[PDB]
Structure 1
Amino acid sequence: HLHNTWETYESIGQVRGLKRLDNYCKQFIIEDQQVRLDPYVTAEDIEIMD
């Protein structure tokens, strides 16, 4: 956990665990921007998720 690297998809290539990064990206990015862009969002939900 000290050799954690800030990487990019073109900087990785084809290694094991790439679909872990894919699942992370799709899940966090899609419902993060969904809860940021929805009109039916209360302040309580955004503060508990923050």
Structure 2
Amino acid sequence: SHLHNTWETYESIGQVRGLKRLDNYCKQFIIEDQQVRLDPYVTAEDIEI
């Protein structure tokens, strides 16, 4: 019901359904997050949008 959302960890989950949803989330969100944070070719407009 979107109210029992819990702050979990990889070792706190074990093996449940939809683990690869979290894998895609963590993986590619952290890849472009660290990519745009470590790129020197980043303008102010892109980071603010």
TM-score, reference length from structure 2:
0.96
User: In 1, Cα distance between the equivalents of 2:38 and 2:20?
Assistant: 26
User: In 2, Cα distance between the equivalents of 1:30 and 1:37?
Assistant: 10
**Runs (4+) off by over 4 Å:** none
Gaps of 5+ in 2: none
User: In 1, Cα distance between the equivalents of 2:36 and 2:48?
Assistant: 11
> Displacement of 1:10 after TM fit?
0.0
| Deviation string, structure 1 residues 7-50 (Cα, Å, up to 9, x no partner) | 000000000000000000011101001000001000000000xx
Match of 1:14 in 2: 15
User: In 2, Cα distance between the equivalents of 1:43 and 1:19?
Assistant: 33
Q: CA RMSD in A?
A: 0.4
User: In 2, Cα distance between the equivalents of 1:26 and 1:41?
Assistant: 21
Aligned residues: 48
